[PDB]
Amino acid sequence: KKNEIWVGIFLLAALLAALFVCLKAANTEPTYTLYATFDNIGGLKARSPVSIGGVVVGRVADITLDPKTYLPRVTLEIEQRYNHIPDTSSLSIRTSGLLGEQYLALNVGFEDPELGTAILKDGDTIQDTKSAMVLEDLIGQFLY
Amino acid sequence: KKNEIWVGIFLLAALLAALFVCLKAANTEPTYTLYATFDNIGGLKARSPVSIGGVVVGRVADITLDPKTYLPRVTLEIEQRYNHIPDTSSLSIRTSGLLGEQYLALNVGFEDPELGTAILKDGDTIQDTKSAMVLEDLIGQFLY
Amino acid sequence: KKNEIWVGIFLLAALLAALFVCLKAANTEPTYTLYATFDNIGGLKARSPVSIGGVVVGRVADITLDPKTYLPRVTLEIEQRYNHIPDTSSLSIRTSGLLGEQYLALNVGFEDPELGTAILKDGDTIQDTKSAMVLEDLIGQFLY
Amino acid sequence: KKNEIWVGIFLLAALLAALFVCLKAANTEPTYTLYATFDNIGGLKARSPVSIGGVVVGRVADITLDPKTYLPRVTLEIEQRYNHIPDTSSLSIRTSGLLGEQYLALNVGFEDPELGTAILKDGDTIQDTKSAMVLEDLIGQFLY
Amino acid sequence: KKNEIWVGIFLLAALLAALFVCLKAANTEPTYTLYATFDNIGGLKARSPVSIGGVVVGRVADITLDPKTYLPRVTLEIEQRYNHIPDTSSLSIRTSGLLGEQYLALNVGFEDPELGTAILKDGDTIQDTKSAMVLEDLIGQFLY
Amino acid sequence: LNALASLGHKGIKTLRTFGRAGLMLFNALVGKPEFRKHAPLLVRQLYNVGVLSMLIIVVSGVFIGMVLGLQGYLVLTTYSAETSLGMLVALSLLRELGPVVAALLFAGRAGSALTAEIGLMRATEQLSSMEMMAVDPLRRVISPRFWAGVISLPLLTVIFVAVGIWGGSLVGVSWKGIDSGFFWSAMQNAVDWRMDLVNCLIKSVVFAITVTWISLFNGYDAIPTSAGISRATTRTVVHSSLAVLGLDFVLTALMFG
Amino acid sequence: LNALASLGHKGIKTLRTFGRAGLMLFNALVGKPEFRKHAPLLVRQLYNVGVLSMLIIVVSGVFIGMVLGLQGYLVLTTYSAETSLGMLVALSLLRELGPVVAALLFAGRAGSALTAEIGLMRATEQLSSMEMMAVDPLRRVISPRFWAGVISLPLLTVIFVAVGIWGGSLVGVSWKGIDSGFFWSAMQNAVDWRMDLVNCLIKSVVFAITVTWISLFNGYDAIPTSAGISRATTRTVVHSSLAVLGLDFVLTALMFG
Ligand SMILES: CCCCCCCC/C=C/CCCCCCCC(=O)O[C@H](COC(=O)CCCCCCCCCCCCCCC)COP(=O)(O)OC[C@@H](O)CO
Ligand SMILES: CCCCCCCC/C=C/CCCCCCCC(=O)O[C@H](COC(=O)CCCCCCCCCCCCCCC)COP(=O)(O)OC[C@@H](O)CO
Ligand SMILES: CCCCCCCC/C=C/CCCCCCCC(=O)O[C@H](COC(=O)CCCCCCCCCCCCCCC)COP(=O)(O)OC[C@@H](O)CO
Ligand SMILES: CCCCCCCC/C=C/CCCCCCCC(=O)O[C@H](COC(=O)CCCCCCCCCCCCCCC)COP(=O)(O)OC[C@@H](O)CO
Ligand SMILES: CCCCCCCC/C=C/CCCCCCCC(=O)O[C@H](COC(=O)CCCCCCCCCCCCCCC)COP(=O)(O)OC[C@@H](O)CO
Ligand SMILES: CCCCCCCC/C=C/CCCCCCCC(=O)O[C@H](COC(=O)CCCCCCCCCCCCCCC)COP(=O)(O)OC[C@@H](O)CO
Ligand SMILES: CCCCCCCC/C=C\CCCCCCCC(=O)O[C@H](COC(=O)CCCCCCCCCCCCCCC)COP(=O)(O)OC[C@@H](O)CO
Ligand SMILES: CCCCCCCC/C=C\CCCCCCCC(=O)O[C@H](COC(=O)CCCCCCCCCCCCCCC)COP(=O)(O)OC[C@@H](O)CO
Ligand SMILES: CCCCCCCC/C=C\CCCCCCCC(=O)O[C@H](COC(=O)CCCCCCCCCCCCCCC)COP(=O)(O)OC[C@@H](O)CO
Ligand SMILES: CCCCCCCC/C=C\CCCCCCCC(=O)O[C@H](COC(=O)CCCCCCCCCCCCCCC)COP(=O)(O)OC[C@@H](O)CO
Ligand SMILES: CCCCCCCC/C=C\CCCCCCCC(=O)O[C@H](COC(=O)CCCCCCCCCCCCCCC)COP(=O)(O)OC[C@@H](O)CO
Ligand SMILES: CCCCCCCC/C=C\CCCCCCCC(=O)O[C@H](COC(=O)CCCCCCCCCCCCCCC)COP(=O)(O)OC[C@@H](O)CO
Numbered sequence A, B, C, D, E: 001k002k003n004e005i006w007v008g009i010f011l012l013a014a015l016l017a018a019l020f021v022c023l024k025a026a027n028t029e030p031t032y033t034l035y036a037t038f039d040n041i042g043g044l045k046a047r048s049p050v051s052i053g054g055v056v057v058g059r060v061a062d063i064t065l066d067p068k069t070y071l072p073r074v075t076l077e078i079e080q081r082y083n084h085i086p087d088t089s090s091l092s093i094r095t096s097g098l099l100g101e102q103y104l105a106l107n108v109g110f111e112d113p114e115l116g117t118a119i120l121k122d123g124d125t126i127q128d129t130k131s132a133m134v135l136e137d138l139i140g141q142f143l144y
Numbered sequence F, G: 001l002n003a004l005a006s007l008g009h010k011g012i013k014t015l016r017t018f019g020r021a022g023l024m025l026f027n028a029l030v031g032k033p034e035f036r037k038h039a040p041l042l043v044r045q046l047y048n049v050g051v052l053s054m055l056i057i058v059v060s061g062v063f064i065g066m067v068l069g070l071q072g073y074l075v076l077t078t079y080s081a082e083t084s085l086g087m088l089v090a091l092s093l094l095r096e097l098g099p100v101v102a103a104l105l106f107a108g109r110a111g112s113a114l115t116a117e118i119g120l121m122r123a124t125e126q127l128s129s130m131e132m133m134a135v136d137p138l139r140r141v142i143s144p145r146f147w148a149g150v151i152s153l154p155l156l157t158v159i160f161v162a163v164g165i166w167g168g169s170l171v172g173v174s175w176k177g178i179d180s181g182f183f184w185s186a187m188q189n190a191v192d193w194r195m196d197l198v199n200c201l202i203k204s205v206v207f208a209i210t211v212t213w214i215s216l217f218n219g220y221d222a223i224p225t226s227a228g229i230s231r232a233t234t235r236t237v238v239h240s241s242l243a244v245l246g247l248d249f250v251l252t253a254l255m256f257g
Helices: A003-023 A137-143 B004-024 B137-142 C002-025 C136-143 D002-025 D136-140 E004-024 E137-142 F004-029 F039-049 F051-076 F082-094 F098-123 F126-131 F137-175 F180-188 F193-220 F226-255 G004-029 G039-049 G051-076 G082-094 G098-123 G126-131 G137-175 G180-188 G193-220 G226-255
Strands: A031-037 A050-052 A055-060 A071-079 A090-094 A103-107 B031-037 B050-052 B055-058 B073-079 B090-094 B103-107 B124-126 C031-035 C050-052 C055-060 C075-079 C103-105 D034-037 D050-052 D055-061 D071-079 D103-105 D124-126 E031-037 E050-052 E055-058 E073-079 E090-094 E103-107
Touching (some): A003 F004, A055 A103, B004 F004, B004 F226, B055 B073, B055 B103, B073 B103, B137 C136, C002 F039, C002 F051, C002 F137, C002 F180, D002 G039, D002 G051, D002 G137, D002 G180, D050 D071, E004 G004, E004 G226, E055 E073, E055 E103, F004 F137, F004 F193, F039 F051, F039 F098, F039 F137, F051 F082, F051 F098, F051 F137, F051 G226, F082 F137, F082 F180, F098 F137, F098 F193, F098 F226, F098 G098, F098 G226, F137 F180, F137 F193, G004 G137, G004 G193, G039 G051, G039 G098, G039 G137, G051 G082, G051 G098, G082 G180, G082 G193, G098 G126, G098 G137, G098 G193, G098 G226, G126 G137, G137 G193
Parallel strands (some): A050 A103, B031 B124, B050 B103, C050 C103, D034 D124, D050 D103, E050 E103
Antiparallel strands (some): A055 A071, A090 A103, B031 B073, B090 B103, C031 C075, C050 C055, C055 C075, D034 D071, D055 D071, E031 E073, E050 E055, E090 E103
């Protein structure tokens, strides 16, 4: 008919308008890869956040202990927007609540002084990589 | 039947008018925006409140880690009632109990002496901004 | 006459069930009003109890942060049975266990030694008072 | 032919739903066996992980009690990829955060020095094998 | 109809035979009863287990505060497998984690010296039995 | 397109089904009070809707409270918080389980029996023979059954919560051995009269209007055959359960958000 | 006494109602396999029972998971444990809500449509005219509808749990702003394949046998009038909901006790 098509068009407009009002509400990105080697990581998993000052800048997608020396080797995915981190940076593992559930804190120890310190790029390796605390040798630190 | 359509249009409009009033009252006041920068904000998410001695006056809109220095830049929304805050006023991050959420303590550093310092308005920055505590440095430095 | 008897049993069962919920599952009197101004009240709320020695003697009515100094001005609803409170009293805010609710610990200054020291009656204010704790100044006072 | 198409869509939806639960919501390999006898295993359980540096390298079976001395006997299922563990190693039981699970922290004695120190493979025993904690002897070691 | 009754009797019997097997397997081995007395048992309820280094071997049947001296008298049920525990074996009350249940630690501290000490067979008492602990006087003696 | 015209055809006849439902409830509840003629009619319908629904409400409330008491015990005993079991059982019934599960069982038992009754009165021409005696069947048949459903679901909800709390204490105190002084006193200072008892009654009144209006209309609008009545009885259970669970989310975001 | 004789009279005719139900299921499922005649009959009944129940299962699962995500967020945010919301939502669906609520909606929608269908086939003498063609109606009518109900309720339960977990993450991650790496990884090492995934399937198979057997028998044993069919359709919803909730307590005490 005539008004039957105008009713079928006024509904499909409203049906896709709510699909654009909700999917655009409540918020892909290019990344690059870093590597780091710790002694103890315990509690860190894949998709754990990487934070600078409390703001999440990356993820963790690996860990994978490596053979022949038995140390863990974390692989990071920092976003492409934060492409100015120097190589003098550190990595530490923080606790974030209870039940484990650790994350990585990347402190941008930026110097850019003499000698010429290089910006971290795709494939490089952070060297400091402090460790995760254990809580059982801290009370052995306290009691002996 | 010329009446079953106009009743059903009014009935379906009166349901979604009730549903829009209900969903708005679950998810105003003129406010004025403040900006501040911290070294570590850990736990402060969006919509976390700002308090005057325990009474909530403000909010947090977005966190937004700043480029070219890599420090977070939190955006406040102080309400328009409390318009005599000096700019010697401090900020801190506190826990809200023992296991609570996180909040911003707007420590009002009252001076108003023979100084001639202004109050604040939209777009001015607080320079005190101590940081949030970590729970990892203090066990590392008190217990070594 | 069989249907009207069973409706009377159905209405009697719903009244015994509403008495069981309102009495065993959930458990107006003339009061009077006091005043106090604390430095920090953090966590206190309207309809929170006041207690002398542990026993509830009144509530909290409408905290309402005071202007011109921005200190919180707590005002109370103490009940007419306890009309002998000396005005050399104290107040503290305590936490009821470790993760419990937060309440006001009205300490009674049981002296009335000389001066004919007055009785808190409607509109009067308290001076001593005490401020709640924040857990960041606890570790600040411990290890600095 | 309309009914048999919709049954095929109903069977396809139940297979995509079973893949979503088994992969994103819940996430046989040849292994080998190591032996250890602790003094106290408090909280440890079958199918609990073993970890080197934080990374899971095996599980726990066989937690039964050893007669004639009444000391707990634990034997492990370490995986065939990590066939280089020196038998001068250590063992510890740790608590995974503060209220988390119990796990075995296999410390690797990375020397393989003189005398060609052997490789743990099937049936071998570990002899360092520290302890678990009880929380009573913590404060007994603190204040006596 | 001579068959609808004998089928329905067999069907109703096969349901309550299934319901009796199921309810029994949700709420054996010969054991031997043991008794002990404490000064404070706080938290130890019925059906709380007894452990050898972390492995549960016993139960608790009833508490039964004894008249004429007013001390509790807990009744144990050790399994018949572990028939070499001497009369010098200690008992203690422990927490099972940090916030756990409560349990009895059957410390098998056997000397078996040059003189022939006996075995805890049925109906004999343990005299070691330290007590449970309370964190009220312990804080009251360490802080005074 | 021949698909857009068929979709707008179903979108028009959905609008005048909502309009027929608004005219049925308006012409049933409005005009000439008649408190003496309708008072015996209310008591008979309060038997069919309310008294005959007490078996599915009392037996289901005891089992649901016993499952809540058993499943909440195993969670709380990890953190040594098992004296808070009565607070957990009572609050999870006064919100979200007392209102919702008693409305889903009301829609299946009393909502199906109301659609089947009215559609049978049109298949045997009882509603047309009342119009011939100059009696309005919307005021005489529909409206005593509406008020019987709005009265009896708030009364069946408070019985559901009462025997559900008793079944939870039957597991916690009697079987597991929690101290009964700690069990009941932790419940009494957690349950507020405004946030918990009044909000339970607001939910069960909104649910009672919705379930009864859907159930009365689907019998009044049914096709008066033996197969068309059974199709409308199934349509009541689907439309009532999607409306109870949908409104339960909107009222949860309002009351406790 | 004249009361003890009337109680023993109802206790005898309850025994031979259980005996008629055991003879109906035994003579439907036993003898002469017939895999080729019954394979087109299974696919048509798998449409009526399974495909036509997907609307009430998908829409109810999203709303129930969203209420669980909103109500569990307000509890966990007191103790700063809100990254454990995904463990709470997934475990409270794999036990006690996935099996139970999908069985109560299966009993109201597909259980009512099965009692109404079979009782209509006896009111129009379709089952008696099949015996006159020397076709057994217990093997040809009853048994394809039994296996369609035992197949489709385990398949509808796994769809209910899947869209319920998605609705819980839709509140926790998208609206409240929990870190999505913490949300999903805390769920994955809490959900075990044996204690959680297999125990969800055992419950939904025990519920599928019980609901389908009750629903097929109440249509086969109904009084073949238009009022006797509607009485048997209501009897299915009451007997299925009391049996699902009763068996849910016994299986909870076994599996997780
Ligand atoms: C110095 C050393 C320090 C050591 C310290 C170490 C230890 C420290 C902590 C230990 C653990 C603490 C234990 C916590 C125990 C307390 C847990 C508890 O009681 O939870 C209650 C559950 O009620 C609730 O809302 C949950 C109630 C609703 C539950 C949701 C319904 C479930 C089903 C969903 C519906 C589906 C649709 C219907 C199905 C068809 C919340 O009540 P609440 O108190 O908050 O008051 C109400 C108001 O404040 C809102 O919260
Ligand atoms: C379509 C056919 C219509 C048929 C109508 C059928 C019958 C309609 C209702 C019957 C009784 C309702 C029982 C509800 C009892 C609850 C009534 C109640 O006291 O709740 C008040 C709020 O209510 C509220 O938000 C408003 C909530 C109540 C609404 C619940 C029913 C919704 C539909 C009602 C529509 C008719 C209303 C006509 C009003 C013009 C709270 O204040 P309260 O003092 O405690 O302390 C306030 C303190 O917090 C500060 O002062
Ligand atoms: C004081 C507070 C007052 C608040 C007032 C708020 C007003 C709330 C209105 C409720 C209307 C209820 C009317 C009943 C509508 C029930 C919905 C319905 O009809 O069901 C299906 C559609 O479902 C559907 O698309 C999905 C239907 C939605 C179900 C209705 C939800 C109620 C509102 C919840 C929205 C939450 C939004 C949350 C946003 C975050 C029909 O398909 P179907 O052909 O198979 O039929 C079967 C047969 O035809 C088989 O051939
Ligand atoms: C030094 C200073 C020290 C300071 C330290 C201070 C702080 C210390 C503590 C802080 C608080 C801790 C927060 C606790 C957060 C964790 C809470 C949580 O996740 O609970 C889970 C809920 O799953 C559950 O079973 C609950 C699941 C089922 C829920 C019941 C269903 C609800 C409805 C009922 C059905 C009605 C019938 C159907 C309706 C018609 C249990 O999973 P769980 O991990 O146990 O693993 C499974 C297995 O071990 C069994 O437990
Ligand atoms: C009345 C008409 C009858 C019609 C019959 C209809 C169809 C009947 C079933 C169909 C498929 C069932 C799917 C269930 C899949 C679950 C099967 C399953 O693997 O579960 C096993 C236990 O099961 C168990 O307790 C027993 C539980 C399964 C029973 C669930 C259905 C109950 C009724 C079944 C009656 C027929 C059974 C005939 C058997 C003789 C666990 O071991 P699993 O290797 O994982 O690791 C063991 C590890 O812990 C140590 O080795
Ligand atoms: C692998 C595991 C296998 C386990 C196997 C276990 C076997 C489990 C048997 C289930 C039988 C289900 C058969 C269906 C029985 C359903 C019960 C029933 O018929 O309902 C009413 C009786 O309710 C009643 O007294 C109460 C009926 C009880 C409901 C059935 C419970 C099922 C078993 C749960 C017991 C938990 C015990 C827990 C103990 C701690 C009848 O009244 P009513 O005239 O109005 O009729 C309406 C009409 O006649 C109106 O005129
Ligand atoms: C189907 C059953 C039909 C029931 C029929 C309807 C039931 C009733 C409806 C609405 C409630 C009426 C409104 C209440 C009237 C008063 C409303 C009001 O705001 O006044 C409050 C008094 O509270 C009051 O004493 C009134 C409180 C007394 C308790 C009465 C509450 C009604 C209980 C509801 C029944 C539960 C049954 C359903 C259970 C599932 C003052 O503030 P409140 O003192 O806090 O602070 C001050 C303090 O801190 C000291 O200064
Ligand atoms: C409607 C859908 C129809 C589904 C059709 C039926 C689904 C399947 C039924 C029963 C399961 C089959 C029995 C499992 C066979 C194996 C049974 C078994 O006991 O073997 C275990 C292996 O586990 C294994 O790899 C087998 C584990 C692999 C995972 C397969 C589990 C089946 C998942 C269930 C589907 C979920 C869908 C429903 C979701 C609601 C060994 O012990 P486990 O290694 O632990 O310790 C050792 C470790 O610590 C290292 O030494
Ligand atoms: C106390 C305060 C609370 C009160 C709560 C009030 C809530 C209760 C009000 C009315 C219910 C009374 C019954 C109303 C009618 C029952 C619902 C209905 O409309 O029926 C069918 C559903 O259509 C359907 O696809 C379901 C269609 C969608 C249902 C509407 C969803 C709810 C409203 C969201 C707006 C969406 C607009 C678009 C979103 C922007 C339409 O039949 P259809 O044509 O197939 O003909 C074929 C054959 O089935 C009958 O002719
Ligand atoms: C865990 C459980 C917790 C305890 C639960 C206790 C049990 C539940 C308590 C109260 C609910 C009872 C509601 C009272 C209903 C009374 C209303 C009534 O009389 O209804 C008539 C019969 O109803 C009826 O089905 C008679 C109702 C019978 C009630 C069910 C009792 C079953 C007891 C044996 C079961 C053995 C199981 C194992 C038990 C150890 C229906 O006829 P109608 O009006 O149309 O015309 C008149 C003419 O036909 C009646 O002769
Ligand atoms: C996979 C493994 C799991 C499988 C699970 C199996 C469970 C499913 C099995 C069979 C259900 C099939 C349908 C069976 C029949 C449906 C239940 C039934 O018996 O029907 C009525 C209930 O009677 C009633 O009072 C309900 C009566 C009590 C129901 C029995 C409770 C459950 C068994 C507890 C024993 C109690 C003994 C005493 C306790 C010591 C009796 O009609 P009545 O005479 O009124 O005539 C008048 C008119 O209603 C029909 O003639
Ligand atoms: C929050 C929700 C989350 C998302 C939920 C998405 C919605 C749900 C998704 C999938 C379930 C759909 C199941 C697919 C069913 C398909 C099976 C089917 O075709 O059934 C026929 C119609 O069914 C039907 O009611 C047609 C089913 C319609 C499905 C409902 C769509 C409603 C959309 C507009 C609502 C506006 C509300 C506001 C939205 C913004 C029944 O005829 P029957 O076979 O006997 O003979 C043939 C001849 O009669 C059919 O022409």
